[PDB]
Amino acid sequence: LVPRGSIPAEESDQLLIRPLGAGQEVGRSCIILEFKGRKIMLDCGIHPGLEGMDALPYIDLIDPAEIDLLLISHFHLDHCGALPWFLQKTSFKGRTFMTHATKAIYRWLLSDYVKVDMLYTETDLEESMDKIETINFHEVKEVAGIKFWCYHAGHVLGAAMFMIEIAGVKLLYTGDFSRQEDRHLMAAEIPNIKPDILIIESTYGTHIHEKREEREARFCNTVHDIVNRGGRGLIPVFALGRAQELLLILDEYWQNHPELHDIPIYYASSVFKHISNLKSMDHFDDIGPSVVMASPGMMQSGLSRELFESWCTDKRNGVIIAGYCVEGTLAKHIMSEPEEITTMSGQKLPLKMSVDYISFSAHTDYQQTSEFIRALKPPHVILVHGEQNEMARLKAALIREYEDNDEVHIEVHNPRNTEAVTLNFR
Ligand SMILES: COc1cccc(-c2cccc(NC(=O)CCc3cccc4c3[B-](O)(O)OC4)c2)c1
Ligand SMILES: [Cl-]
Ligand SMILES: [Cl-]
Ligand SMILES: [Fe+3]
Ligand SMILES: [Fe+3]
């Protein structure tokens, strides 16, 4: 393979890409890149559906003292949740980078995550902070002969798509990205610099997102239906990111419906005209009807789980899941509509509240991913960050898009965890 940036050719160099997490799955993103003696780790998250050391990527398969560079795409815990453990409980001595906004949220986010088999303590989190260097967007940095810079990814504030260049070979890692313009977030940039390799998320496979006006209308109608019948509405959200979006939509809908002005909306985490802030359960009068937006987004524990257990037995109540549901979480389990749930204390409760799923996770759909790949046409595309069935359908659909393309033949890979993808560059 001739690098796209580049006579009797000499020796070929082999590039190695191996996912330790997010390989044919969603969670614990951690992809290893090896080329010409350099070793790079892309993200270092935890699996939200597993517990303890099982929620970590397969770090045992590598020698962490040989990792030259660690790049963190955004502040979500499936991409940086394992970072304090990797920085403090392991022989890693390389350099770590994330954007300025990402580091700022990371310190408070993981501090919250620790408070609510503990991989690390809040002590470990604070000592590893100075090991994390920052980087501006559209600015080249070099570490051990590795040139890298980042583009805007959309998705959440500070989310970055890292471009990596070693010996003229360019690789683009999208992390999590979205191409649909938000109310408070830009769409992901499409680089004009063309990469040899693309590592791209596959969260929604070949699904196509419902138009934003349709999902917003159904979201507001479902909330309205819940409080109108005297119910309490639970909107589990991950602390920062999509929560501000949903609060804008509800604040606008409340203003245009005066019959809802007396119904409170609470946002509980650690300028609207109809939304109040909430500190904890102690500061909250559970008076129905009401709307409560609480963390975490998948009711694994914490406030959203406590409110769900308090409200799930009343059919007037309802929960609205707005994010992507990972296997092993309570939010994914209730999609099957079980007769009963199990509380954190081990008690069985009948699930009688309504359960609705209106997606607002801010990932690309097939159209956005296909357009993104067509604009770049990288000879090799590697799918990560997606369930096995969704990723297999995305691979087949993208392959079919380029069988009749005489200009470029694009190879698509969907490696399992620990599975290596090998590419040779002249
Ligand atoms: C009490 O706090 C807790 C307790 C236990 C587990 C978690 C936890 C762990 C991992 C991820 C998460 N959620 C997130 O990062 C939110 C974003 C998210 C959520 C689900 C799936 C995906 C993403 B994505 O946009 O990064 O793409 C895939 C929470 C938190
Ligand atoms: Cl070199
Ligand atoms: Cl191998
Ligand atoms: Fe994310
Ligand atoms: Fe993710």
Q: What is the DSSP code string of 18-76?
A: EEEESSSSSSS-EEEEEETTEEEEE-----TTS-GGGGS--GGGS-GGG--EEE---S-
Residue 38 lies in a domain: yes
- The response to whether residue 176 sits with its C-beta less than 6 Å from ligand 1 reads yes
Contact 318, 355 (CB under 8 A): yes
C-alpha 338/C-alpha 348 separation (Å) is 11
What strand order describes the sheet that includes 275-278? 275-278, 265-268, 290-294, 232-236, 318-321, 354-357
The answer to the question of whether 54 is labelled as a binding residue is no
C-alpha 385/C-alpha 387 separation (Å) is 7
Distance 71 CA to ligand 2 centre (A): 20
- The response to whether residue 296 sits with its C-beta less than 6 Å from ligand 1 reads yes
What strand order describes the sheet that includes 411-413? 141-143, 146-152, 160-166, 169-173, 197-201, 380-384, 411-413
Does 17 lie in the same domain as 46? yes
Residue 227 lies in a domain: yes
Does 349 lie in the same domain as 400? no
Residue 383 lies in a domain: yes
Contact 390, 205 (CB under 8 A): yes
C-alpha 21/C-alpha 1 separation (Å) is 27
The CATH number of residue 330's host domain is 3.40.50.10890
Contact 356, 320 (CB under 8 A): yes
Both structure tokens of 151: 């583009």
DSSP string, 301-353: SHHHHHHHHHHTT-TT-EEEE-SPPPTTSHHHHGGG--SEEE-TTS-EEE--S
Both structure tokens of 208: 């196509």
Does 254 lie in the same domain as 277? yes
Strands 421-425 and 354-357: unpaired
Q: Whose CA is nearest to atom 28 of ligand 1?
A: 26
Please identify, among 357, 379, 408, the residue that sits at the C-terminal boundary of a domain. Answer: 357
Q: Answer yes or no: 47 catalytic.
A: no
Q: Whose CA is nearest to atom 22 of ligand 1?
A: 324
Number of domains in the chain: 2
Residue 315 lies in a domain: yes
Other residues' Cβ atoms within 10 Å of the Cβ of residue 248 = 16
DSSP string, 81-106: TTHHHHHHSS---SEEEEEHHHHHHH
Does 396 lie in the same domain as 336? no
Structure determined via: X-ray
C-alpha 345/C-alpha 352 separation (Å) is 19
- The response to whether residue 324 sits with its C-beta less than 6 Å from ligand 1 reads yes
Closest ligand 1 atom, CA of 201? 27
- The response to whether residue 158 sits with its C-beta less than 6 Å from ligand 1 reads no
User: In 3D, which of 81, 89, 28, 45 has the Cα closest to residue 64?
Assistant: 89
The answer to the question of whether 74 is labelled as a binding residue is yes
Select which of 152, 209, 224, 363 is catalytic. Answer: 363
Residue 398 lies in a domain: yes
Please identify, among 338, 357, 376, the residue that sits at the C-terminal boundary of a domain. Answer: 357
- The response to whether residue 238 sits with its C-beta less than 6 Å from ligand 1 reads yes
Contact 132, 103 (CB under 8 A): yes
CB neighbour class for 189 (10 Å; exposed up to 12, middle 13-18, buried from 19): middle
Residue 245 lies in a domain: yes
User: In 3D, which of 49, 69, 55, 57 has the Cα closest to residue 19?
Assistant: 57
C-alpha 326/C-alpha 316 separation (Å) is 26
Cα distances (Å, whole numbers) of residue 106 to 82, 129, 190, 418 = 11, 9, 26, 27
Does 159 lie in the same domain as 56? yes
Both structure tokens of 171: 């690789």
Distance 33 CA to ligand 5 centre (A): 19
Residue 7 lies in a domain: no
Please identify, among 332, 357, 382, the residue that sits at the C-terminal boundary of a domain. Answer: 357
Distance 300 CA to ligand 1 centre (A): 10
Does 199 lie in the same domain as 87? yes
- Enclosing domain of residue 300: 212-357
Q: Which residues are CB-contacts of 207 (< 8 A; sequence separation ≥ 6)? A: 365, 366, 390
Q: Which residues are CB-contacts of 232 (< 8 A; sequence separation ≥ 6)? A: 226, 286, 288, 289, 290, 291, 292, 307, 311, 314, 316, 317, 318
Q: Which residues are CB-contacts of 326 (< 8 A; sequence separation ≥ 6)? A: 26, 27, 47, 48, 49, 78, 298, 332
Q: Which residue has the tokens 């309802």?
A: 318
- The response to whether residue 81 sits with its C-beta less than 6 Å from ligand 1 reads yes
C-alpha 237/C-alpha 363 separation (Å) is 15
Does 331 lie in the same domain as 291? yes
Does 232 lie in the same domain as 198? no
C-alpha 110/C-alpha 83 separation (Å) is 10
Does 220 lie in the same domain as 183? no
Residue 2 lies in a domain: no
Does 83 lie in the same domain as 17? yes
Q: What's this structure's resolution in Å?
A: 2.2
The CATH number of residue 131's host domain is 3.60.15.10
Mutation pick for ligand 1 pocket among 30, 46, 76 (CB with most ligand atoms within 8 Å): 76
- The response to whether residue 156 sits with its C-beta less than 6 Å from ligand 1 reads no
Q: Which amino acid appears at position 94 of this protein?
A: G
Does 143 lie in the same domain as 99? yes
The answer to the question of whether 76 is labelled as a binding residue is yes
Distance 420 CA to ligand 3 centre (A): 5
Phi-psi group of 60: left, alpha or beta (phi > 0 → left; psi -120 to 50 → alpha; rest → beta): alpha
Give Cα 50 distance to the centre of its chain: 16
Mutation pick for ligand 1 pocket among 119, 155, 238, 303 (CB with most ligand atoms within 8 Å): 238
Contact 214, 37 (CB under 8 A): no
Both structure tokens of 302: 């914490």
Q: Which residue has the tokens 């002005």?
A: 261
Distance 246 CA to ligand 5 centre (A): 19
Does 335 lie in the same domain as 229? yes
The answer to the question of whether 78 is labelled as a binding residue is yes
